[PDB]
């Protein structure tokens, strides 16, 4: 018994659940032994037969004969007695192995618990995407139903997702918080986040472990307001102690005044299971060693850490229904003075390359020891243009307001990086093929549009525009040349996925 | 000198003494091309354009535009021989439907060029006479609100492949995370992205020997050995269904016996290829090359978009549906506009498909102005600031953001969601084609689990 | 080997826990007598886990050493941790 | 080698392995995948 279909997200499943189509659940059966403990339940499933999904496909007698319940056998053979096996349809709470090819580590095949859902896809909770390397742009996964109590018990005790949280490969958790919940976590845990009475009570409806007691708000007067840290402390289990730094924590702050009482709230402290201070991000809820997720597994174990993942997602996704998140054209735009600084950097950088060329052409350039004059020239030019890329990129990152939605996703660590911001806003930069500047594929030139022996940045593939400004036609082609190399390399390394694993094993 | 075949070449404008030979009179003559006799051949014959191959290009200086011919403070080149006609002609067919492709990371343009080939539309106008084995036709294709000038020659207006959809880029309830998508169920009830699937079955009479032949006829249990629990009473006396019959899995569409060398006939009748309930659409009967009777049956089934179905936007942002919310539950603007699709913002920043964001902006200007927007690449006349300035004149925030209200509670959302019309594509891949119900690398993992009784139960 | 000179660790391994519960569950499903008052429990695998935590499972684990010798450990003799 | 069904694994287990043998005691190995226990006698 196995099944395959497309996977889709379901943030209302636990990390240890899988949502199974009702048609698949009807096609898959499990042989359950008849006993005086279950005979009444199994007789009902037999009376419902294969006709109504909560039913059964066969009765297997001690004789080994099977009364097939598909083709409506006579009621006088619907009798059950102890030791018969009823092939009931798969039901809520059955244990399955769930898998995605290529299988690369034992977390590619984990135990999940079935929840039957409407419609036709498999549903997984989004934290489990990271072990599987899964997403939902068309991926399919395999469900394997263990057929015996013995091998059911094996998977329960050895292979369930919560037991897989930490990998012996690197003594780290394999699951983080991801995507919306991670960008929401960061926003939710700023000092600024005050929650009204009605909002708090809504979020507490989702916290599954909550003991039913509303905490006294951080502010009582003039108006009762709870902080986001104050509700997140109710999510953190037990009495965990942890210290982390937020991704924007400044280097000097641990050494000057305000080592504690962090001005930017950039120092994370958890004590006695309570988040005292600090903005949480990937550094605290991600897969890295010593994250608050890691320490939860070490201190509290798998069963409690399963709940921790589930409560973070369900309450904070329901808070994002108030705060929202987006990205648009506004986030990709800088101020006029930022653009003038970016442009003045590029204007000088190009003139510096021309001065290198003027020395090389005039034979005023002396080679570096161990490098050829061509290597000496190309090294100097690549230094100038890579400095310009980094100088313009930091100038772009300085422009971004605290509202900017690129920065919100980078600083949370949920998606994107500082170079993506830099390329969208400031400069796409140098295009390379086989690690070199764009080759002279025509005789002594890169395209017919250039004159011969043009070593300047534009000729050799420096894209001085951003993705917002859009590429010029030559830049567009040279950016297609550099992008082809990355497509080839991906095709190569996707040919080797299991190669060394298969040979070593 | 090469007169050889198989040389790839392209037309280029001739430049002489830093001037085009193409003058205003040639454009005037080409403007009257429907009734004046002048054509492209006359442009070649006048020596105004020229074909050049990939190693005559070793000898040209190409102006990228006649801007390059103008006098300049520092002169790069004074010896141009030719000029590009339009730089966007470097693109091919499927890349020419991408708006603002100079604003995308180049791998995502490559992914659209493959995904465009999978977008439903109207594949050809005479599709009613074609008995193609599989075809997909969209109920309500639209031309893009935002279009490239090259899309004219692709005839994309006439056979479009997609619909302009109101897209919110929002983290809503989380069912659009990773690459998933939320769709408005009420739009789907109104026929948004609805399509029909056509499957055509051929069957043939044969004469295999002196006393064995296959003939179309209605089988019967009193004569045929091969009979099953399949259903034969949909067949007519000719052994064929008629169009307009509703069909399901293990319905027989073509009854065909073979006389055998209680029983006297074997049954070789053809069944509906899947359990998908469809309707017989056409049945044509003929003779083959051999003069034996020959049948084709076409079946249709309507495919309403489901949570499993895959969609894309022309910017390499493929995604399945994740859930469908009715209009009551969708977020809404003050004006009561709910989005048709909500995509996740996490799809954007690392992929850097900024052309997707510019399309939504230009499309909002286009739907308000009532004028289809020119998204041709390398156009110095269209810039994001100018699109924003035009959008402001219609009373929208200049960057396309909008105040949305939560559908469940009616509260304003604290962030202002980016919303605009975006041309979406329904892809061939549908969950109803794929829902179905353990190799070397799987055994290797079950050894590392130590699930030895599982590893032998599964083998 | 005798009860003395046991050199294997006194803890039950996870692999032993998995197979002991799996094997005892199938026994309980096959009407094997149950060594604890079931308070209306009916799933044989939850009864086996109940019997494990009570140290009531009537099973012995024969552990084989790489010399071919073996140690017999009663399930109640091992330190049970889950 | 007697096979005994788990229904008999009560106190009378050893008596039953005799009573069954007298109708048709070693270490009873539990067979993997089956409830039956195999006793050599």
């Amino acid at each position: 018994f196995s099944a395959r279909t497309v996977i889709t997200p379901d943030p209302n499943l636990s990390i240890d659940q899988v949502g199974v189509p009702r048609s698949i659940a009807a096609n898959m059966t499990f042989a359950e032994i008849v006993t005086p403990f279950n005979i009444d339940r199994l007789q009902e499933l037999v009376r419902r037969g294969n006709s109504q999904y909560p039913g059964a496909k066969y009765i297997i007698r001690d004789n080994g004969d099977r009364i097939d319940l598909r083709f409506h056998p006579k009621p006088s053979d619907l009798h059950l007695q102890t030791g018969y096996k009823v092939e009931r349809h798969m039901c809520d709470g059955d244990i399955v192995i769930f898998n995605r090819q290529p299988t690369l580590h034992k977390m590619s095949m984990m135990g999940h618990r079935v929840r039957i859902l409407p419609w036709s896809t498999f549903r997984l909770n989004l934290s489990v995407t990271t072990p599987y390397n899964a997403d939902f742009d068309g991926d399919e996964m395999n469900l394997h139903l263990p057929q015996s109590l013995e091998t059911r018990a094996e998977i329960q005790e050895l292979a369930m997702v919560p037991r897989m949280i930490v990998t012996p490969q690197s003594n780290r958790p394999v699951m983080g918080i991801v995507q919306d919940t991670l960008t929401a976590v960061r926003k939710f845990t700023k000092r600024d986040v005050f929650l009204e009475r009605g909002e708090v009570m809504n979020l507490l409806m989702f916290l599954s472990t909550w003991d039913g007691k509303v905490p006294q708000p951080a502010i009582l007067k003039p108006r009762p307001l709870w902080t986001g840290k104050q509700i997140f402390s109710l999510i953190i289990p037990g009495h965990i102690n942890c210290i982390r730094t937020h991704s924007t924590h400044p280097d000097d702050e641990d050494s000057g005044p305000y080592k504690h009482i962090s001005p930017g709230d950039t120092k994370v402290v958890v004590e006695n299971g309570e988040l005292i201070m600090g903005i949480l991000c990937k550094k605290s809820l991600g897969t890295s060693a010593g994250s608050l997720v890691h320490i939860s597994y070490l201190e509290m174990g798998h069963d409690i850490t399963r709940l921790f993942y589930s409560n973070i997602q369900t309450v904070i996704n329901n808070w994002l229904l108030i705060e929202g998140h987006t990205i648009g054209i506004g986030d990709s735009i800088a101020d006029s003075k930022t653009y003038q600084d970016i442009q003045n950097t590029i204007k000088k950088a190009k003139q510096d390359v021309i001065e290198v060329i003027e020395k090389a052409h005039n034979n005023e350039l002396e080679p570096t020891p161990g490098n050829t004059l061509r290597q000496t020239f190309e090294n100097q030019v690549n230094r100038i243009l890579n400095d310009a890329r980094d100088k313009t990129g930091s100038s772009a990152q300085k422009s971004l307001s605290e509202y900017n939605n690129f920065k919100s996703m980078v600083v949370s660590g949920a998606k994107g990086s500082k170079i993506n911001i830099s390329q969208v806003i400031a400069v796409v930069g140098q295009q390379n093929v086989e690690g070199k500047r764009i080759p002279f594929g025509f005789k002594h030139r890169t395209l017919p549009h250039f004159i011969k022996d043009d070593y300047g940045p534009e000729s050799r593939g420096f894209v001085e525009n951003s993705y917002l400004a859009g590429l010029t036609p030559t830049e567009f082609f040279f950016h297609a040349m550099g992008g082809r190399e990355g497509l080839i390399d991906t095709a190569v390394k996707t040919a080797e996925t299991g190669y060394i694993q298969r040979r070593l094993i | 000198i090469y007169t050889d075949a198989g040389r790839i070449c392209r037309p280029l404008l001739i430049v002489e003494k830093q001037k085009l030979l193409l003058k205003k009179r040639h454009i005037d003559q080409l403007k009257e091309r429907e009734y004046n006799n002048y054509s492209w051949q006359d442009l070649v014959a006048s020596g105004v354009v020229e074909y050049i191959d990939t190693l005559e290009e070793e000898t040209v200086m190409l102006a990228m535009t006649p801007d390059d011919l103008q006098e300049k403070e520092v002169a790069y080149c004074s010896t141009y021989t030719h000029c590009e006609i339009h730089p966007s002609m470097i693109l091919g067919v499927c890349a020419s439907i991408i708006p603002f492709p100079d604003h995308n990371q180049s791998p995502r343009n490559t992914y659209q060029s493959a995904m465009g080939k999978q977008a439903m539309g109207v594949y050809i106008t005479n599709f009613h006479v074609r008995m193609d084995t599989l075809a997909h036709v969209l109920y309500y294709p639209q031309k893009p609100l935002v279009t490239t000038r090259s899309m004219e020659y692709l005839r994309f207006r006439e056979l479009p492949a997609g619909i302009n959809s109101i897209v919110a880029i929002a983290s809503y309830t989380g069912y659009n995370q990773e690459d998933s998508v939320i769709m408005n169920r009420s739009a789907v009830d109104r026929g948004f992205f609805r399509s029909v699937f056509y499957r055509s079955y051929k069957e043939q009479e044969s004469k295999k020997g002196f006393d064995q032949e296959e003939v179309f006829e209605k089988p019967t249990r009193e004569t045929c050995q091969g009979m099953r629990h399949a259903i034969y009473d949909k067949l007519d006396d000719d052994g064929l269904i008629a169009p307009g019959v509703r069909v399901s899995g293990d319905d027989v569409i073509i009854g065909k016996t073979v006389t055998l060398p209680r029983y006297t006939k074997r049954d070789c009748s053809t069944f509906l290829r899947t359990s998908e309930t469809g309707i017989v659409d056409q049945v044509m009967v003929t003779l083959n090359q051999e003069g034996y009777k020959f049948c084709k049956i076409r079946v249709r089934s309507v495919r309403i978009p489901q949570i499993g179905d895959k969609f894309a936007s022309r910017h390499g942002q493929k995604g399945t549906c994740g859930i469908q919310y009715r209009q009551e539950d969708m977020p809404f603007t003050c004006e009561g506009i709910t989005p048709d699709i909500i995509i996740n913002p996490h799809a954007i920043p690392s992929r850097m498909t900024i052309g997707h964001l510019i399309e939504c902006l230009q499309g909002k200007v286009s739907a308000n102005k009532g004028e289809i927007g020119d998204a041709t690449p390398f156009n110095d006349a269209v810039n994001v600031q100018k699109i924003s300035n035009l959008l402001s004149d219609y009373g929208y925030h200049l960057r396309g953001n909008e105040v949305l209200y939560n559908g469940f509670t009616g509260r304003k959302i604290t962030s202002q969601i980016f919303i605009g019309p975006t041309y979406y594509q329904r892809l061939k891949h549908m969950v109803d084609d794929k829902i179905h119900s353990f190799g070397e690398m799987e055994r290797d993992c079950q050894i590392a689990h130590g699930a030895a009784q599982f590893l032998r139960e599964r083998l | 080997q005798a009860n003395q000179k046991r050199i294997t660790t006194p803890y039950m391994t996870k692999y032993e826990r998995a197979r002991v519960l799996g094997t005892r569950a199938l026994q309980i499903a096959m009407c094997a007598p149950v060594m604890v008052e079931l308070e209306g429990e009916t799933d044989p695998l939850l009864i086996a886990m109940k019997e494990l935590k009570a140290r009531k499972i009537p099973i012995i684990i024969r552990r084989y050493l790489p010399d071919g010798s073996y140690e017999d450990w009663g399930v109640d003799e091992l330190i049970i941790s889950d | 080698e007697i096979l005994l069904h788990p229904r008999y694994f009560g106190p009378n287990l050893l008596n039953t392995v005799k009573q069954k043998l007298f109708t048709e005691i070693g270490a009873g190995v539990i067979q993997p995948g089956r409830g039956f226990v195999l006793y050599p006698v």
């Binding site: 094996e154 050895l158 | 055994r443 050894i447 689990h449 130590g450 699930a451 030895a452 009784q453 590893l455 032998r456 083998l459 | 692999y15 032993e16 998995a18 197979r19 002991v20 094997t23 007598p33 060594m35 009531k56 499972i57 009537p58 099973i59 012995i60 684990i61 024969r62 552990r63 084989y64 017999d72 009663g74 399930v75 109640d76 | 694994f9 009560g10 106190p11 287990l13 050893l14 270490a27 009873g28 190995v29 539990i30 993997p32 226990v37």
Partner: peptide
Amino acid sequence: GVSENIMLGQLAPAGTGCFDLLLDAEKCKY
């Protein structure tokens, strides 16, 4: 060997198969 037992469809000596279980007839009395 693991593969050798797999080729014969026997329990691999890996993991859950590296040991044997015996019925304790003495604990059955209660």
